[PDB]
Amino acid sequence: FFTRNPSELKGKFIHTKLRKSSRGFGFTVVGGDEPDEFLQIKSLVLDGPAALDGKMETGDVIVSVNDTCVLGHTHAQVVKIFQSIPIGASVDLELCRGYPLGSSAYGSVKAYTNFDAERDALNIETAIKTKGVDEVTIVNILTNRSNEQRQDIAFAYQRRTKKELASALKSALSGHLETVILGLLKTPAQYDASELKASMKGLGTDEDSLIEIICSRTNQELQEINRVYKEMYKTDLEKDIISDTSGDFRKLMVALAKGRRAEDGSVIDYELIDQDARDLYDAGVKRKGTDVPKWISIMTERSVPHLQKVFDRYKSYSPYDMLESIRKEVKGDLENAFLNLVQCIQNKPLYFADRLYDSMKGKGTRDKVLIRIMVSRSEVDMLKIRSEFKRKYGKSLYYYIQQDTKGDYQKALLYLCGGDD
C-alpha cells in the first residue's frame, strides 16, 4: 500500500527535530526505488543524532522534510535534501508508523522486533543439547525470524560454539523438518543456487525444479544467484545448464537464467505490444510447425508488464490464449517451461498457489516442491499466494498444509504460511 497524501495515511504521526552532527543525522533510509513505494527508516546509528532523539524508529514512513512533502519522491531526491543540510543545521521530520517494511510487504515472515541474536543462538544451542532435542524451540525461533536475522543467529552461534549452526542442526534434525530448517538458514541466493545444483545431480535432471526456479526468479534475483552459484560450486550456472539440457528447452533455460530481461519501461509501447502479439501468432497457431526461437526471444526479452499486455492483445489474433496455444504448439520439457513461464508473467502468486495445490492435491505430498515454495516465498509474496489460493480453491493454504503434513514438519510449514484465511 502506497499513498502520496498525508490525509490517506492511517498511522501515527510523529514530529521530531534533529541537528546534523559530524557523522550525519545517524540513520539509514530505504525504499523509494519502484514508482509507488514509501521511504522508511532502515537502521539507526546508536551514537548518532537520530537514535539520540529516540522518536524515530525503523519502518517509519518519511512524510515530509523541511515543510516539503516527500511522499512519492524517489530515493535520490530526498537523500539530496538531507545531504545538502550543512553540519550543525536543523532538519524537521514528520514520520508515520503503522506500515511494514516495503520490501517484505507481502511476505508472511517479518523481522522480529526485539531481536537478540545472542539470546536466540543460546536458546538454539540449549534446544540442540537438550536430551532428545527440543525441536519445538528450534522451530518456534527460526520460523519467526527474517532470513537476515537468521544470518545473525548463525554468526552468534558460531561465535559461541566454534561450530557452524547448519552443521549442528544437521546432526540434530532429520527428514522433512531438517530440509525445512536448513533451507531457511541459507540466504535466498544460496538456497536457490543449491536447489538448482540438486536438480542437476546425476545423469537425470529434475526438469520441474529447474523450470520452477528459472521461470519465476526476477533479473535481480537471477543476478545474485549466478554470482553465489559460481562462488559455491566453482562453475557458472549457465555451463551446468548447457550440460544438463538440450534442444529448444536448453535455449529457453539459458536465456531466462541470464536474468537480462528488459526492465519495466516508463512508457507503454502499444505498437510493439501489437507487433509482438502478431509475431507470437504467426510463429505458432497461424502456421504449421512452430518458430520456437521467436517465442523464446519475445518471452524472455520483453519486460513483464509489456508481455502481460501482449498476451491480452494476442487474444485478438488467436482463438486460443497463450496457455492454450502453448499446449497446442509444443510438448515435453519445452511445453512445461513455456507454461510455467507465462503463468509467472500473468500472475506469479497464482502460479505458486497452483504449484502448492498440485503438491498436495493427490496421494501423498511432493514435499520438495511444498518446502521450497514455503521457504523461498515466505518473505516475498506469501500473503498474495494465500489470497489466490483461498479465492481459487475455497479453503486456505493453511488448511491444505495441515491436512497433508504432520508433526514438527507441519508446524514449521504452518509458521511459514503465517496463519489461516
The binding site for Ca ion (CB under 5 A) comprises 132-133, 170, 200, 205, 244, 360, 404
Contact between residue 397 and residue 353 where contact means Cβ atoms under 8 Å apart: yes
Distance CA 339, CA 315 (A): 16
Distance CA 235, CA 237 (A): 6
**Cβ 365 to Ca ion, closest distance in Å?**
5
Angle 364-367-370 from CA coordinates, rounded to 5°: 115
**Cβ 114 to Ca ion, closest distance in Å?**
27
**Cβ 141 to Ca ion, closest distance in Å?**
15
Closer residue to Ca ion (CB): 194 or 223: 194
Task: Give me the sheet containing 27-31, strands edge to edge.
Answer: 12-19, 90-97, 61-65, 39-44, 27-31
Nearest to 193 by CA among 260, 257, 106: 257
Give me the helix-helix angle, 117-128 and 135-142, nearest 10°.
160
CA-based end-to-end distance of the chain = 20
In order, the DSSP letters of 325-353 are: HHHHH--HHHHHHHHHHHHHHH-HHHHHH
**Cβ 415 to Ca ion, closest distance in Å?**
17
Closer residue to Ca ion (CB): 65 or 326: 326
Half-sphere exposure of 2 (CA within 13 A, CB side): 18
Closer residue to Ca ion (CB): 106 or 317: 317
User: How far is the CA of 1 from the CAs of 4, 9, 18, 101, 399, in angstroms?
Assistant: 11, 10, 28, 11, 27
Question: Which grid coordinates belong to 365?
Answer: 505430498
User: How far is the CA of 7 from the CAs of 4, 10, 71, in angstroms?
Assistant: 9, 8, 11
The residue number whose beta carbon is nearest to Ca ion equals 205
Closer residue to Ca ion (CB): 161 or 223: 161
**Cβ 203 to Ca ion, closest distance in Å?**
6
Distance CA 240, CA 7 (A): 54
Helix spans in 27-74 (H): 49-53
Closer residue to Ca ion (CB): 384 or 411: 411
Contact between residue 298 and residue 280 where contact means Cβ atoms under 8 Å apart: yes
**Cβ 366 to Ca ion, closest distance in Å?**
9
Closer residue to Ca ion (CB): 88 or 132: 132
Closer residue to Ca ion (CB): 115 or 320: 320
**Cβ 399 to Ca ion, closest distance in Å?**
12
Closer residue to Ca ion (CB): 94 or 212: 212
- Residues contacting 359, CB < 8 A, separation 6+: 365, 366, 367, 369, 370, 373
**Cβ 77 to Ca ion, closest distance in Å?**
49
**Cβ 225 to Ca ion, closest distance in Å?**
18
Nearest to 181 by CA among 150, 216, 212, 155: 150
